[PDB]
Amino acid sequence: NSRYTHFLTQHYDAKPQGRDDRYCESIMRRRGLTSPCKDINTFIHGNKRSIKAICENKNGNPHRENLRISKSSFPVTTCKLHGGSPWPPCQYRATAGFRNVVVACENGLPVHLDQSIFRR
């Protein structure tokens, strides 16, 4: 999947520093999500092997018929736009957690992250 590599650029960070507000503003810039400022974006941490495994029994179960929910929890960081302005420089607030994730899978690869679960 070109979709998988895209999912990775939008939602995967193997080496997060701080996972604080400073981290969010920096990563959102690095991943090209500041033109205009994405309103919310979650990054998953850890190794890619475990995220891929959500698409199979190894680390997932079916969810909402057509999605997958992880067996394991993952370190995550949700970056939420702060201050209203949709143009850079973008201000973000970080919410770090350790929780299961829901993805859509195509051909054994995650291609979409369900953002709805990180609003809460």
What are the structural domains of the chain?
A: 1-120 (3.10.130.10)
**Which is nearest to 20 in space by CA: 75, 79, 73?**
79
- The answer to whether 55 is a known ligand-binding residue is no
Residue 31 · residue 10 · CB < 8 Å: yes
The coordinates were experimentally obtained by X-ray
Q: Which residues are part of the catalytic machinery?
A: 11, 112
- The answer to whether 79 is a known ligand-binding residue is yes
Question: What span, in angstroms and rounded, lies between the C-alpha atoms of 55 and 49?
Answer: 11
**Which is nearest to 54 in space by CA: 106, 2, 118?**
106
- The answer to whether 19 is a known ligand-binding residue is yes
Sign of the Cα torsion 59, 62, 63, 68 reads positive
Whose structure tokens read 């960081």?
77
Between CA 56 and CA 63, with CA 60 as vertex, the angle to 5 degrees is 110
**Contacts of residue 9, Cβ cutoff 8 Å, sequence gap at least 6:** 31
Token reading at 66 = 């057509």
Pairing of strands 60-63, 40-44: unpaired
- In the chain, the amino acid numbered 101 is V
| Resolution of the coordinates, Å | 1.6
Q: Is the peptide bond before 62 cis (omega within 30 degrees of 0)?
A: no
